Nucleic acid binder design. Structure first.
Ligand SMILES: Nc1ncnc2c1ncn2[C@@H]1O[C@H](COP(=O)(O)OP(=O)(O)OP(=O)(O)O)[C@@H](O)[C@H]1O
Ligand SMILES: [Ca+2]
Ligand SMILES: [Ca+2]
Ligand SMILES: [Ca+2]
Ligand SMILES: [Ca+2]
Length: 901
DNA sequence: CACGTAAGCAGTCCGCG
DNA sequence: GCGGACTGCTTAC
């Protein structure tokens, strides 16, 4: 097999590499790598190395890496560019793996672990590690086993062994319901003292050294706790055994408000699952507890226990251990679904970077572009300092707030990467500038043609047309990968809808789900078999189709993220290829493209309708337009349609056969006007929206920019079994909006769009009447809580104190003195509730850690003093008032002459 | 900790005769 | 009582 790296480090003048050899074995080597860097040289000097601008360079070979680093410093002292890859381990990987890396995940040791630490005096700070580690569960992907290290004797209590028999049993048998599928995979090791536990864990770690190390909050808690505890008990040298190269560093992670400390373990790649989830999931969650995320992702119930976690080991050690094991398993289950480890490996090996560098698109693209240029013996420029400067972004059209009955939307494929490719935007393809006219002059095609030689953006920039830049070349490769995965995602989505339709008429039979590949549209034979299946098999098939869709989503959306981040990185001062000329060339071209096509679509539809000056495009944001289809429907007449699906088909055909060709013609003209390298502005129909045929539903509405709702029947070729609400920006979509309020507002919107005013009024009246019965957590607002200390003046709100911070300070006074009470952690999220006048808390609101029940000492008082009136007005009535006034209808029935008879 | 900008709403402070 | 200036937070793209 082809060899591949596992980890790489620079330690002094040595590269330390763990890798899989040509026989599939894990090996480690220390290499005295001699790096090369580059200086410009006379044109008269013969060389094969050239910088990206075509200027010749001499290669400087250094005796060691420290010599190379010192040379860079000298070159700065002299005032001369030091060219080449200054991160020597990336150069090492490039030299050692000079081909497309094919990796075998089965050979990569992926470890998932979680620790327990009983603490009677509040949160056990990892920097102090003053409390015993009393449980570790460590899952190893190569063994497929859960290794459980269980401390039976502690200063906080002596306990009996954990029983695997009780663990397997149902909660109703007094058991812990550890999933039957992992029971046989548990290797249980009890210990009569903590020193013995930790020494054995380290021996185990040496035998089974993680390559990828993950878990939940492992980087911020588990790793620093274990390291510091071992350091405290045994000394530094023993703690450093967590690194295969016995090297660690305390790393200070700094933000805008403060800083925290993590432990870098050289020769390990830590991918904390909470950070993978935050970067790659495209959610914003009210809480990031594992319990909360597991419920959201997997629909598994809360791990229930009595009393504080600080007393769980003493009171119920059996449950304590079982829950530690389940915690580790839940992360594996989340990964089986979301597949972020697979994503990181894919991206990391593609770029030839340390796998943990996938968090950084700047590092990822630096390596991709470096490897690409190196293939041609080209030499990368030195990174430079730049001051941070603001620059313009996208255009967003101001919509007229209204209901909109029939709507068809259109959207440009991968816009910013497509602009880069079309225009040929790259550091080395800059050809010069032209004199810029106001943007509106280009939009209306009245400005002088920018160039007859070069490819142009309306920000004034010109680019070469003779050859692709490295940025277009490399962005295209990842774009093409993305396109493949999006194909699979949409097929699985369409396949899901087939199954949903068949579920209307399930068969009374005992059968099995079909063995099919959900990434490909179901054949006719499969469709006929599906129509004969039981509900049990159909539901299992739906679950599998949906899992395939999620896998495709992860793969496609994060490749989209990577390529969009390259466009963004051109506007980040730390990117080697930072250039506001290129960043603005992309964004200004985008503004033109949207407004150009707005004009073209209006012109086309005014022509076919026989009108003049009528605005068919009602809205647009960045790269999308929303077209009113009312006049199109009215031209055939609503009464001519058999059912909803009939007019959806008609609009689909109209969009495909009439509008898209006109849009294409419009963009080809724009490409010629800008003299671009390649026409890549591909704007396809996205959504078809409208009320159910024969209903009083309004179809859709806009309140403002980035705030709208549509009743969608077809999205990007997926014809839904049931209409789907596309809601953007509105409070139903915000993590800050209470859970039950999101749900209620969504139903209000559904009724507005599908059923009409009377239906909306009926639901509002009921919600208003019943909402006080809702669980307090379900009606609590949510906010991130930054700068608590800034606004804290003797326990009370300082000037300009934000509402949620005020709530935290209220909470802090109420729990004062308690070492046990849950503390609000700076930078994390809180639930927030308003408090009625004259409450014993002394202020108008209270806040507590999100994803938790408020502590029992004040729970009863919070419940008694919760201000339901304020809660309803702020989270529900105010947003609903906005939706309904925009839509020109009332959530309460107005008086009429009919009242009364 | 980790790519970019546009832009919405909650809330504070305080003007507005 | 609303709105501008401002901070804070959160989405859409
Ligand atoms: N997370 C992001 N970071 C940087 N730029 C972004 C991001 N999201 C969107 N953009 C910019 O807005 C443009 C339009 O965004 P949109 O979400 O429509 O996706 P797209 O890139 O056009 O891909 P698709 O093919 O899925 O439409 C992008 O091309 C770019
Ligand atoms: Ca725990
Ligand atoms: Ca798009
Ligand atoms: Ca059937
Ligand atoms: Ca879009």
């Amino acid at each position: 097999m082809k060899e591949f790296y596992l980890t790489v480090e620079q330690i002094g003048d040595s590269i330390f590499e763990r890798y899989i050899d040509s026989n599939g074995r894990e090996r480690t080597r220390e290499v005295e790598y001699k790096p090369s860097l580059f200086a410009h040289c006379p044109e008269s000097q013969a060389t094969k190395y050239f910088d990206i601008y075509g200027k010749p360079c001499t290669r400087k070979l250094f005796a060691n890496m420290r010599d190379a680093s010192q040379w860079i410093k000298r070159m700065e002292d002299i005032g001369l560019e030091a060219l080449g890859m200054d991160d020597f381990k990336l150069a090492y990987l490039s030299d050692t793996y000079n081909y497309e890396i094919k990796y075998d995940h089965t050979k990569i040791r992926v470890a998932n672990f979680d620790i327990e630490v009983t603490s009677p005096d509040g949160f056990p700070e990892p920097s102090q590690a003053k409390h015993p580690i009393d449980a570790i569960t460590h899952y190893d992907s190569i063994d497929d086993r859960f290794y459980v290290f269980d401390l039976l004797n502690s200063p906080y209590g002596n306990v009996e062994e954990w029983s695997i028999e009780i663990a397997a049993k149902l909660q109703e048998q007094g058991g812990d319901e550890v999933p039957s599928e992992i029971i046989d995979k548990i290797i249980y090791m009890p210990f009569d003292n903590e020193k013995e536990l930790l020494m054995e864990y380290l021996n185990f770690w040496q035998q089974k050294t993680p390559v990828i190390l993950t878990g939940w909050n492992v980087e911020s808690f588990a790793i620093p706790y274990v390291y510091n505890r071992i350091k405290n008990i045994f000394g530094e040298s023993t703690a450093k055994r967590l690194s295969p190269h016995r090297k660690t560093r305390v790393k200070v992670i700094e933000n805008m408000y403060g800083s925290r400390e993590i432990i870098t373990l050289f020769g390990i790649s830590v991918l904390d699952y909470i950070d993978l989830y935050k970067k790659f999931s495209f959610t914003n969650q009210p809480s990031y507890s594992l319990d909360y995320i597991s419920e959201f992702e997997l629909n598994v119930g809360k791990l229930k226990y009595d009393g504080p976690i600080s007393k769980l080991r003493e009171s119920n050690h059996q449950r304590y251990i079982s829950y530690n094991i389940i915690a580790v398993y839940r992360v594996l289950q989340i990964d089986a679904k979301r597949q972020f480890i697979n994503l990181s490996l894919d991206m990391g090996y593609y770029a030839k970077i340390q796998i943990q560098s996938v968090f950084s698109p700047i590092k990822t693209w630096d390596a991709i572009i470096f490897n690409s240029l190196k293939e041609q013996n080209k030499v990368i420029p030195q990174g430079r300092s730049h001051p941070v400067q603001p620059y313009p972004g996208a255009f967003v059209k101001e919509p007229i707030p209204n209901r909109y009955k029939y709507v068809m939307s259109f959207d440009l494929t991968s816009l910013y990467p497509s602009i880069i490719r079309q225009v040929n935007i790259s550091p080395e393809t800059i050809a010069g500038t032209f004199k810029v006219a106001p943007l509106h002059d280009y939009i209306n095609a009245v400005a002088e043609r920018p160039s007859d030689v070069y490819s142009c953006s309306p920000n004034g920039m010109m680019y070469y047309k003779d050859r692709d830049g490295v940025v277009p070349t490399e962005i295209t490769k990842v774009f093409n990968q993305r396109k493949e995965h999006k194909g699979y995602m949409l097929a699985a989505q369409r396949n899901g809808e087939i199954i949903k339709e068949a579920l209307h008429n399930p068969n009374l039979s005992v059968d099995e789900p079909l063995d099919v590949d959900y990434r490909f549209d179901f054949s006719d034979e499969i469709k006929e078999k599906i129509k004969k299946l039981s509900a049990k098999s159909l539901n299992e098939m739906l679950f599998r189709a949906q899992r395939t869709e999620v896998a495709g989503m992860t793969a496609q959306i994060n490749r989209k993220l990577l390529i969009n981040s390259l466009a963004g990185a051109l506007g980040n001062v730390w990117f080697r290829y930072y250039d506001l000329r290129n960043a603005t060339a992309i964004t200004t071209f985008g503004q033109m493209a949207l407004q150009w096509i707005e004009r073209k679509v209006n012109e086309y539809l005014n022509e076919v309708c026989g009108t003049e000056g009528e605005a068919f495009v009602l809205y647009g944001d960045t790269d999308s337009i929303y077209v009113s289809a009312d006049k199109i429907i009215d031209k055939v007449g609503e009464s001519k349609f058999r059912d909803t699906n009939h007019w959806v088909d008609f609009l689909d055909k109209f969009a495909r056969e009439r509008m898209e060709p006109a849009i294409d013609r419009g963009f080809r003209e724009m490409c010629e006007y800008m003299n671009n390298k390649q026409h890549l502005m591909f704007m396809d129909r996205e959504a078809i929206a409208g009320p159910p045929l024969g209903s009083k539903g309004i179809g859709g509405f806009w309140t403002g920019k980035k705030r709208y709702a549509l009743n969608v029947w077809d999205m990007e070729g997926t014809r839904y079994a049931e209409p789907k609400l596309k809601i953007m920006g509105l409070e139903t979509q915000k993590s800050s909006t209470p859970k039950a309020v999101q749900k209620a507002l969504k139903e209000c919107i559904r009724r507005m769009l599908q059923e009409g005013e009377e239906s909306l009024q009926e639901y509002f009246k009921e919600f208003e009447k019943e909402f006080r019965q809702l669980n307090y957590i379900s009606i609590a607002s949510v906010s991130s809580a930054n700068n608590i200390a800034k606004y804290d003046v003797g326990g009370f709100p300082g000037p300009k104190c934000p509402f949620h911070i005020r709530g935290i300070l209220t909470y802090n006074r109420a729990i004062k003195g308690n070492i046990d009470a849950p503390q609000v952690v700076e930078g994390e999220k809180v639930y927030v509730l308003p408090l009625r006048e004259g409450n014993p808390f002394g202020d108008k609101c209270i806040a507590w850690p999100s994803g938790t029940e408020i502590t029992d000492l004040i729970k009863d008082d919070v419940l008694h003093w919760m201000d339901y009136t304020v809660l309803l007005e702020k989270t529900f009535i105010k947003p609903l008032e906005g939706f309904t006034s925009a839509a020109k209808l009332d959530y309460e029935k107005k008086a009429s002459l009919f009242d009364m008879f």
